[PDB]
Amino acid sequence: MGLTKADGGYLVPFQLDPTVIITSNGSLNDIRRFARQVVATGDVWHG
Amino acid sequence: MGLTKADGGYLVPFQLDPTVIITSNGSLNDIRRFARQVVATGDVWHG
Q: Which is nearest to A36 in space by CA: A26, A47, A25, A28? A: A47
Asked if residue B4 lies in contact with residue A34, where contact means CB atoms within 8 angstroms, the answer is no
Q: Which is nearest to B14 in space by CA: A43, A34, A23, A17? A: A43
Q: Cβ–Cβ of A41/B9 closer than 8 Å?
A: no
C-alpha span between B10 and B1 (Å, rounded): 11
Nearby residues of B3 by Cβ (< 8 Å), 6 or more positions away: A43, B9, B12
Å resolution of this model? 3.5
Name the method of structure determination. cryo-EM
Give phi and psi for B16, each to the nearest 5.
Answer: -145, 145
Chain B positions touching A45 (Cβ under 8 A) are 15, 17
C-alpha span between A43 and A35 (Å, rounded): 21
